Amino acid sequence: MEAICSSLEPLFPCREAAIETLGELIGDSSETYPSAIYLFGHSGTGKTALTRAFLKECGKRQNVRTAHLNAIECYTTKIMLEILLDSLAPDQGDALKVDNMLDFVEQLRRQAATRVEDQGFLIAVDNAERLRDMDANVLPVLLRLQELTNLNLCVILLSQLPFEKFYNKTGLSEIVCLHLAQYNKAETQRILGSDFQQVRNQLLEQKKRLEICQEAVTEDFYNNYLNLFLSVFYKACRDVPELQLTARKCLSTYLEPVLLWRHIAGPLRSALTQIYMRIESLELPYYAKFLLIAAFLASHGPKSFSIDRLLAIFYAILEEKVGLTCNLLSQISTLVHLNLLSFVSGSARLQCTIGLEFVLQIGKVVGFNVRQYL
Amino acid sequence: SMQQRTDLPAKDSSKSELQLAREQLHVSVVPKSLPCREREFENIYAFLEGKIQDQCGGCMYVSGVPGTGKTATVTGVIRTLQRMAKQNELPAFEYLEINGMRLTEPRQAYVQIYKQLTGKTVSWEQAHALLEKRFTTPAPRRVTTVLLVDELDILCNRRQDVVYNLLDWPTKSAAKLVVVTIANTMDLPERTRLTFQPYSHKQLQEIVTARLGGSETFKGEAVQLVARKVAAVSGDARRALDICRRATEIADTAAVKCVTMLHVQQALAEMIASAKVQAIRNCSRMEQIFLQAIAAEVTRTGVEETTFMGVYQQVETIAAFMGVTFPPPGRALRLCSKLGAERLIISEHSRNDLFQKILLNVSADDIHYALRV
Amino acid sequence: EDYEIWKARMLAKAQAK
Amino acid sequence: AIMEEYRSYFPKWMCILNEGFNILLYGLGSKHQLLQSFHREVLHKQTVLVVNGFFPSLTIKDMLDSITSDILDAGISPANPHEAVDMIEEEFALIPETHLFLIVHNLDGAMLRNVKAQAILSRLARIPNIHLLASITPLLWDQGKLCSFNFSWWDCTTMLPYTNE
Amino acid sequence: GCFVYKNGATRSLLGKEVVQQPFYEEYRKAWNQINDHIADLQHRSYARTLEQLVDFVVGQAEREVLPTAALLTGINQPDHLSQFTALTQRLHAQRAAMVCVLQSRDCATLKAAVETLVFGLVEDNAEVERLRRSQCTMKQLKSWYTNNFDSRRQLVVILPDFECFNASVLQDLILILSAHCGSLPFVLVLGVATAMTAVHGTLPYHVSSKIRLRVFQTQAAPTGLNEVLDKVLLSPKYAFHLSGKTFKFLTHIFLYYDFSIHGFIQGFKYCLMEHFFGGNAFALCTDYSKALGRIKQLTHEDMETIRRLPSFRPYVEQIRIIAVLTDDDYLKKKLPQLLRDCLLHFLLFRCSLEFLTELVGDLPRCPLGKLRRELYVNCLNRAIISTPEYKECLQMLSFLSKDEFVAKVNRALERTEQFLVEEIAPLELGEACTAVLRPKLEAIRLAVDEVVKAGRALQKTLQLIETQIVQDHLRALQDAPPIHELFVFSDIATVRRNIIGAPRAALHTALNNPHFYMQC
Amino acid sequence: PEADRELVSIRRFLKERLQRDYTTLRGYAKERSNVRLLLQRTAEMGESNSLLLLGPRGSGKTTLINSVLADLLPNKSFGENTLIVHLDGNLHTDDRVALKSITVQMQLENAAVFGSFAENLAFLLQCLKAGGKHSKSVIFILEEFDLFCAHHNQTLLYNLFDVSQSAQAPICVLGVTCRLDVIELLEKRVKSRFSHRQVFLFPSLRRFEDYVDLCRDLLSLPTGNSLLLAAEKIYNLQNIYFSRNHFDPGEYGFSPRLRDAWNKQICKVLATQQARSTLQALHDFDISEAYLKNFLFRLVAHLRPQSPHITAEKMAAVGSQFEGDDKIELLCGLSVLELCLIIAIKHHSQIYDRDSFNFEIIYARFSKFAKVSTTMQAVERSIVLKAFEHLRIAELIMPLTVQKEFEMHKLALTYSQIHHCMQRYQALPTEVAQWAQS
Numbered sequence A: 001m002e003a004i005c006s007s008l009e010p011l012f013p014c015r016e017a018a019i020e021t022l023g024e025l026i027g028d029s030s031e032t033y034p035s036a037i038y039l040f041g042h043s044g045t046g047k048t049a050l051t052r053a054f055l056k057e058c059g060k061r062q063n064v065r066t067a068h069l070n071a072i073e074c075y076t077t078k079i080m081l082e083i084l085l086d087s088l089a090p091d092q093g094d095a096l097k098v099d100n101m102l103d104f105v106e107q108l109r110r111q112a113a114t115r116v117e118d119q120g121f122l123i124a125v126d127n128a129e130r131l132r133d134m135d136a137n138v139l140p141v142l143l144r145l146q147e148l149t150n151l152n153l154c155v156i157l158l159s160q161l162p163f164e165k166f167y168n169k170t171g172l173s174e175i176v177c178l179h180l181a182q183y184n185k186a187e188t189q190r191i192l193g194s195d196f197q198q199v200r201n202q203l204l205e206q207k208k209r210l211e212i213c214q215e216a217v218t219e220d221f222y223n224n225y226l227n228l229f230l231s232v233f234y235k236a237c238r239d240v241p242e243l244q245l246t247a248r249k250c251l252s253t254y255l256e257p258v259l260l261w262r263h264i265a266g267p268l269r270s271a272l273t274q275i276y277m278r279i280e281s282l283e284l285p286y287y288a289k290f291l292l293i294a295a296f297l298a299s300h301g302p303k304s305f306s307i308d309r310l311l312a313i314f315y316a317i318l319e320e321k322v323g324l325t326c327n328l329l330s331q332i333s334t335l336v337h338l339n340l341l342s343f344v345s346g347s348a349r350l351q352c353t354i355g356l357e358f359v360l361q362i363g364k365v366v367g368f369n370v371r372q373y374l
Numbered sequence B: 001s002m003q004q005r006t007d008l009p010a011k012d013s014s015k016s017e018l019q020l021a022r023e024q025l026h027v028s029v030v031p032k033s034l035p036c037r038e039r040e041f042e043n044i045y046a047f048l049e050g051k052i053q054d055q056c057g058g059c060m061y062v063s064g065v066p067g068t069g070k071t072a073t074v075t076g077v078i079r080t081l082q083r084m085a086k087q088n089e090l091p092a093f094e095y096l097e098i099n100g101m102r103l104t105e106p107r108q109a110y111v112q113i114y115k116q117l118t119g120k121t122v123s124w125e126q127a128h129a130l131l132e133k134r135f136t137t138p139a140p141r142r143v144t145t146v147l148l149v150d151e152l153d154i155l156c157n158r159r160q161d162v163v164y165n166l167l168d169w170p171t172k173s174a175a176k177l178v179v180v181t182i183a184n185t186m187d188l189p190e191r192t193r194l195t196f197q198p199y200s201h202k203q204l205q206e207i208v209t210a211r212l213g214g215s216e217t218f219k220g221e222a223v224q225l226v227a228r229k230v231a232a233v234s235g236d237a238r239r240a241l242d243i244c245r246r247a248t249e250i251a252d253t254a255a256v257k258c259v260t261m262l263h264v265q266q267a268l269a270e271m272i273a274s275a276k277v278q279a280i281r282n283c284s285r286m287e288q289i290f291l292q293a294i295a296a297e298v299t300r301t302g303v304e305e306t307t308f309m310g311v312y313q314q315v316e317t318i319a320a321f322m323g324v325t326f327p328p329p330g331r332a333l334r335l336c337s338k339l340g341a342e343r344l345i346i347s348e349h350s351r352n353d354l355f356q357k358i359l360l361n362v363s364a365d366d367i368h369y370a371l372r373v
Numbered sequence C: 001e002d003y004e005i006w007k008a009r010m011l012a013k014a015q016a017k
Numbered sequence D: 001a002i003m004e005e006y007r008s009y010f011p012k013w014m015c016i017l018n019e020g021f022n023i024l025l026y027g028l029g030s031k032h033q034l035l036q037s038f039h040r041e042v043l044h045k046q047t048v049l050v051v052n053g054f055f056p057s058l059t060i061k062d063m064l065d066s067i068t069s070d071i072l073d074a075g076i077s078p079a080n081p082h083e084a085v086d087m088i089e090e091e092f093a094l095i096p097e098t099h100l101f102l103i104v105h106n107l108d109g110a111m112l113r114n115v116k117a118q119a120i121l122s123r124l125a126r127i128p129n130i131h132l133l134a135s136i137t138p139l140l141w142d143q144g145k146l147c148s149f150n151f152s153w154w155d156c157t158t159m160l161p162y163t164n165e
Numbered sequence E: 001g002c003f004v005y006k007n008g009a010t011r012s013l014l015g016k017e018v019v020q021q022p023f024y025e026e027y028r029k030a031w032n033q034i035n036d037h038i039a040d041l042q043h044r045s046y047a048r049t050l051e052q053l054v055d056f057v058v059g060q061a062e063r064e065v066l067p068t069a070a071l072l073t074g075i076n077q078p079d080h081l082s083q084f085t086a087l088t089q090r091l092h093a094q095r096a097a098m099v100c101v102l103q104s105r106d107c108a109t110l111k112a113a114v115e116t117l118v119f120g121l122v123e124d125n126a127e128v129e130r131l132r133r134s135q136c137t138m139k140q141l142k143s144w145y146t147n148n149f150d151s152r153r154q155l156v157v158i159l160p161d162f163e164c165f166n167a168s169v170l171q172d173l174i175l176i177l178s179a180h181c182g183s184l185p186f187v188l189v190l191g192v193a194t195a196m197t198a199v200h201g202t203l204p205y206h207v208s209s210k211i212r213l214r215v216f217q218t219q220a221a222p223t224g225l226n227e228v229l230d231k232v233l234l235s236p237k238y239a240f241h242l243s244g245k246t247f248k249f250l251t252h253i254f255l256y257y258d259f260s261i262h263g264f265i266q267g268f269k270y271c272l273m274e275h276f277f278g279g280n281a282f283a284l285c286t287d288y289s290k291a292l293g294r295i296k297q298l299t300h301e302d303m304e305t306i307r308r309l310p311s312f313r314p315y316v317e318q319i320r321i322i323a324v325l326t327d328d329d330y331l332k333k334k335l336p337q338l339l340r341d342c343l344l345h346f347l348l349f350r351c352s353l354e355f356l357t358e359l360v361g362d363l364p365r366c367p368l369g370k371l372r373r374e375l376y377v378n379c380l381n382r383a384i385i386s387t388p389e390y391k392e393c394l395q396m397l398s399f400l401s402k403d404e405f406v407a408k409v410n411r412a413l414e415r416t417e418q419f420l421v422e423e424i425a426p427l428e429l430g431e432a433c434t435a436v437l438r439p440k441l442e443a444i445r446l447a448v449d450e451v452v453k454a455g456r457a458l459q460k461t462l463q464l465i466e467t468q469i470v471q472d473h474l475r476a477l478q479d480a481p482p483i484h485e486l487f488v489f490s491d492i493a494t495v496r497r498n499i500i501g502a503p504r505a506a507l508h509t510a511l512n513n514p515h516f517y518m519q520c
Numbered sequence F: 001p002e003a004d005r006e007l008v009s010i011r012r013f014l015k016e017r018l019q020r021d022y023t024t025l026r027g028y029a030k031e032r033s034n035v036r037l038l039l040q041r042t043a044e045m046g047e048s049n050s051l052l053l054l055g056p057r058g059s060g061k062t063t064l065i066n067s068v069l070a071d072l073l074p075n076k077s078f079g080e081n082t083l084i085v086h087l088d089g090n091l092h093t094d095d096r097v098a099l100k101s102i103t104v105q106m107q108l109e110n111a112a113v114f115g116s117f118a119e120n121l122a123f124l125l126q127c128l129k130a131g132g133k134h135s136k137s138v139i140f141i142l143e144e145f146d147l148f149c150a151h152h153n154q155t156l157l158y159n160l161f162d163v164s165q166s167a168q169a170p171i172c173v174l175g176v177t178c179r180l181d182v183i184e185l186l187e188k189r190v191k192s193r194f195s196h197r198q199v200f201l202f203p204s205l206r207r208f209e210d211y212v213d214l215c216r217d218l219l220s221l222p223t224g225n226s227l228l229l230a231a232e233k234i235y236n237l238q239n240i241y242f243s244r245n246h247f248d249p250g251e252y253g254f255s256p257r258l259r260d261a262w263n264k265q266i267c268k269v270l271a272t273q274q275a276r277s278t279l280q281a282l283h284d285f286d287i288s289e290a291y292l293k294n295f296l297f298r299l300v301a302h303l304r305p306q307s308p309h310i311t312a313e314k315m316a317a318v319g320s321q322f323e324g325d326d327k328i329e330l331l332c333g334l335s336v337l338e339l340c341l342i343i344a345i346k347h348h349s350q351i352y353d354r355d356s357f358n359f360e361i362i363y364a365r366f367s368k369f370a371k372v373s374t375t376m377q378a379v380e381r382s383i384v385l386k387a388f389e390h391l392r393i394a395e396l397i398m399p400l401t402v403q404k405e406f407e408m409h410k411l412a413l414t415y416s417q418i419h420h421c422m423q424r425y426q427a428l429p430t431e432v433a434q435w436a437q438s
């Protein structure tokens, strides 16, 4: 149980107590497992990567059989039991077939063996919050799988939510709740500063700039840069992988005068507005433009509207009185079908779904003023 | 075949007389002639005897609340008719039978009826076609057939045709079919008739004393108390024959050969159970504060349906009044989930915390009765 | 004008040409 | 005289069907006798699936099961309706020169007024082999359906009362 | 509710008589010509975006977030399904990838989406080189991919109708495809219809954290219509020209209602059908040699309805006629000269339009419009010299300084001569066209030499350009050469009432006056 | 090291006893005696009975059934004239699944399952009708009986009682369920054919001294002769199912000095007022033995060799882990922007008395702070929108069950949790801390 904590901590700075608690509960394979473990924390806290590396190191170092799942893949229980039995019952090949949860219990019951090998089983179910929306017998069986299979196993569950959300009318078995608290700013600086050798080697692989780089790129430069980075970015988000992926690109912009705070603090506020967008003038037909701005004028939540009020405001702003042809209602239907409109209900009630800037752009490219009618 | 015992069953002579009464009182030992069902036995016998001798066919609908001896009288009349038919005192007849709760599907009766005829197993479409060819075509010498049909109402729902087929086969002259239908609800064909009244105090005492015979293992007032406290509930005879076996097991453990009246009172208190107050007394103190605050929220707000939020606010008020601290809402929802698993309260799934609705399943005066006294 | 009266008057002017 | 004029239209309707266009009639009154006369006098030998869209109790399962079981003899259609249209599209790709006309009185009927059944009907009218005639609203037809429904509108305004419809 | 009349179904409705008529043969030929030309133009338009998409998939293949490339296509999806089909054709030809196309109809739930995705990938690889859809698990897709291509094809997943998806179903689909990355190389091309803001607004944090999308832009639908109108329907080599009312009505349907090229093609197809289905007299309308064979083929009803067309009437009125109006065989002998007259008139119409479109669309303010289609509809609807806008154009052209004026006429000269060499020269009956047009162009060139060597002569050059190109080679449709009705299709009323649909107007006129229809 | 191995043996022993050990129980003389006499009379005399264990979840009902079976099976009369059919309401979700499990476990002629569900039902009823007093007694054990009441028509239940009502094979049906009113869930035919005897299994430790005594018996090391008798009984039940794993106590053999020091430390720790206060908190919360076994498992899990002894501070630390609110620990992990958004939601809720809000009202109430905050001045609306969706995916905000920016919402928190987060939060800027006060 000591080797797993000795192996994970170099991969994982500042997660000493959580790795220690998991290595106390499901570290050694000879000791019996708790019936279910539910560790939780915010996004980016490191529970997917932690349980994956933890299950890999215990399953490689010892006799345990590991099974990692994503419950979003399991739109029905057959898929889940098939992946669970493909991992927990190795080398059965394509002759494996599971109908329902009972056959899964029998085929896991066949796997019991002698105590001298100290075998164990482990089932991690990432994104466990989706389990309450499916067959409703999946979660109660998964909380007592150790009791039903008579087998040395533990059922890890992983979600962003407390276990208070998971109770149902039939009740649930006991669980070991466990918390992964999100890092404060000092520990976040220590993890972001942990890849100094990586960014130093990366800049060294890409010539007076290389030697003038290697004379001055040391830890205090990167730590002060990460301090300026968390001086501005820690207020908006604490999700650590997003901070890593942004800090590498922002350092690639920051390094140029060296190759100081104002020249980088310009672009940093531009990147904060475009955080989480990950990218590496809507032309319309004429009568579709008039129907879209007539729906915007009728609604300015935006109000729901009947089609007869919509045709009346369109005829009031047309000043031409076109006939009600098929193409007009086809444009209404395809503005609905493109999510330019919506179906708030359904006498039918439409709901406009655009901003003011696009309406003013449409009214500039048409020549019908909008603010006069607003 | 079913596996036989490795050991011989224990002999009758080693049994105590009270054990002999316990086995005579078992509900599986149907008497050869049913007490207190003479008019209905004579009615079904005269009807079935006229339909058998006339070789014409027909239908009958018997009805009554469960356990009033419907199926036992019908099987007793048909067993006596088969013995009379074996001695050539009656015209011979074939007896098909089905049961509606033994059928996975209402249409599977077509699989079963043919299984009582030829013995071949076929799909229900081919079986329905062969049954129509058997019934609608006149083929002398056709014998009259009696089709007992238990539990008609499961065949009635959602398929429609099966109950229409079972009531439509007698009307053709070519099918000498006499179908008898046992059911619980009286008004079932709309939703030749006969109604089985619930057994009364006197018929229900007479039944148990007939099962006992001349034996003195039961006192005469014990059966009277059983009948008085069962006939006010249902009129079921199986309930009386179960209460009597429990009273026999109580006297057996009291080492008395007579079932004195306090054993009947103890058996009645155990069978007509009301053990919610014992559950409230064995609940934990925080669950008791929750159960008090739910009734407090019902009396305060007027509406019987209480939200978790106002219940938790009254919980904090009563906990401040009682001087104990309360758990935070992430454990109070677990307490509400335990009471919902115990069905002391009705509650929604916990995903909509603070806005889930909590009906009080137990009566409001039961909580004060459990926790005061 | 109708095509028929034009064709008839043209055929008459045609035989008269 | 108007019905004779609509009856005189008939050979032109046969030519328009060869180019993949579908016929639509949008008059006020009942148009059932006109589509029945075109089936009686002209389509007396071509395969024809009359569909009464004014039926209270029809399902999209009933019409797709009718095509897949009676015309193609494929048995009951698969439970996903779009898979049933995919299977119909495959099995009609298997048989060139075996056209299936379908003549839907009231395309706007009681169980086809949802957008899903109209997408199913557009995917069915999309097949090169099969052709659609229909009686009549265009609010449920978006531009993708109106392109897949390669309609040729025809103003058949009878004054007949709505008895059966 | 339904009745079956099955007649021999197992597991071209017209007979031989109609197909053997000349009009069906010539109609099928002209329709096949126009359809193959539109397909060739669309492939030459798409090839650049095709190369960019294939370069993105192969570059992802050379090397977790799934790489993904949004393709910002137009409002109307079905035109671009052929484009996606060409993408599948290229990815199969290069052995770089295999494609599943996830339509929105297949994904009511996450289960149906996964089943159609795995089924489309497995059967797509089966068709490059039938298990049930119930057992097409993603684990079986993984085992099949390990069984095959690990010894790498990308698994492209087109989603052509991105807005029609349910949002939760789309987010679940993105999370399932992102979970299998690394093991299964996925590229997720999309088909957004609105803007990238709709994608960023319907996708929250957790789905967009695992997306590395790149935006590509398909060309605009009006740009595609302008390219199609300039290179196909206005091509000299096709003898069937639309009238200006029909042209303006179809372009009005495209620009003012829906951006579907296919609806414009279907309206032009209905126009071509109503032109060609009146008889073999409309089967006269093609290339000159087969047309002479048709004249040797002709019967008599075609002669009577070629007498019946309105433009024949001025031709007889300006006149021997006995042998024209009733002798039939003299009109059959006469027909090739008149047909040569019409084809020569439309070729001169195209070259004069090229000259005038350069000379007027280079001008500021442009009273007559820029593109060839706008000038084309204006000169066919009515006479161009009598318009006030042409007078304003002549005023602004005599108002010009000499240098920009000589540069504009020299550009028009080089443009019209390059058009005569590159486009008019391959066509048969084209040598007579350059023989008619070129001396007038040489006279205009001598006027250019006169205005270079010399203000008033600029007015003489403008007068010569007006009276030698606009006046004689750009006449109004009433002044068109006779039996141009064989070549134009001016009847827009019936095509409009048969294409445009107004059920409410028909119900309104049926509920006000039945006498308008029934004639009671 | 020998002291390290004795601690490893103690930790392995306590974990295996708290988690497995499915047969031994404490308390319940009368109820276990009733179940044993009922099953013994069914196996011998052939009476067809029915019984319904009831009680709160976490009380030992499955452990009671396993104890009665472990007492009856080595008799070789119950083990030879009676076949046992376990059934579970969680696994046999449909009538055909329960029927195939019955057909397999009874080793019927059509098991070997072949045939249809209807052929299986006909074959099961024919094998039961074919018997009499000479046939082997079946004992059905229908765990989670209330979900079996949820099946269509309750049709399987109607068979399993009716054979008990008929002169056929001597079967016994031990329904086991947590609901206290399952007999009111039954259909009227099933309710008439049910025998209404009902064994209740309420815990016997409502008074606190019994709870401390149970925690002491759960923690004390038994004398080695009791371990030998337990090993003899487990070998006897394995000489004849869960029985292959179980406790198996013959592997452990503690030295007398080790048992004496551990029992002394256990009684001394339970004499202290602090450990009594922690057990007082857990006994006030939930009295069920599964809760105490969960707490004891978290406590036994901490015995590292460097710190062998249980101490009162360890019980106070694990009890603080139990007693702590979990939403406050998630609110402490948020960044300052989402916390400002939650304070704005709290102000809008305090003013309008839990009226439903919107992204727009909350963004406006936040912008009125951000224009004068002099530290939040530069934040764009898109960052606030991503913070709002991050609050929404954490189920801190729930929909009222439409645009993403205009959906109606309800706060999931009490005000006291936000006010306690205002004190517990790390490195809060003072402007936010002062705006929160008013």
Ligand SMILES: Nc1ncnc2c1ncn2[C@@H]1O[C@H](COP(=O)(O)OP(=O)(O)OP(=O)(O)O)[C@@H](O)[C@H]1O
Residues within 6 Å of the ligand: A011, A012, A013, A014, A015, A042, A043, A044, A045, A046, A047, A048, A049, A050, A159, A160, A191, A240, A241, E206
């Ligand atoms: N303490 C840490 N040290 C180093 N890296 C970390 C740490 N915590 C998280 N990460 C990084 O976060 C990345 C992904 O985090 P992960 O996906 O496990 O979060 P999650 O809780 O699963 O998110 P979600 O709940 O939204 O699925 C990993 O690549 C990992 O490197």
Ligand SMILES: Nc1ncnc2c1ncn2[C@@H]1O[C@H](COP(=O)(O)OP(=O)(O)OP(=O)(O)O)[C@@H](O)[C@H]1O
Residues within 6 Å of the ligand: B027, B028, B029, B030, B031, B034, B035, B036, B037, B064, B065, B066, B067, B068, B069, B070, B071, B072, B073, B182, B183, B184, B207, B237, B238, F188, F189, F192
């Ligand atoms: N009059 C009676 N005399 C003796 N025993 C009786 C009498 N009535 C009922 N019983 C006993 O009670 C049982 C009742 O079974 P029966 O089949 O008559 O009930 P039922 O009315 O058919 O019930 P259900 O309507 O629910 O099917 C019988 O086994 C019988 O032993």
Ligand SMILES: Nc1ncnc2c1ncn2[C@@H]1O[C@H](COP(=O)(O)OP(=O)(O)OP(=O)(O)O)[C@@H](O)[C@H]1O
Residues within 6 Å of the ligand: F018, F019, F021, F024, F025, F026, F027, F056, F057, F058, F059, F060, F061, F062, F063, F064, F178, F289, F290, F293
């Ligand atoms: N009377 C008892 N004697 C011994 N152990 C008990 C007793 N009551 C509860 N337990 C312990 O409680 C834990 C759960 O008990 P058990 O499995 O019997 O509950 P259960 O009857 O399955 O509840 P449910 O059926 O409602 O899930 C077990 O670890 C067991 O050791």
Ligand SMILES: [Mg+2]
Residues within 6 Å of the ligand: A048, A126, A127
């Ligand atoms: Mg995760």
Ligand SMILES: [Mg+2]
Residues within 6 Å of the ligand: B070, B071, B150, B182
């Ligand atoms: Mg009965």
Ligand SMILES: [Mg+2]
Residues within 6 Å of the ligand: F061, F062, F143
């Ligand atoms: Mg249990």
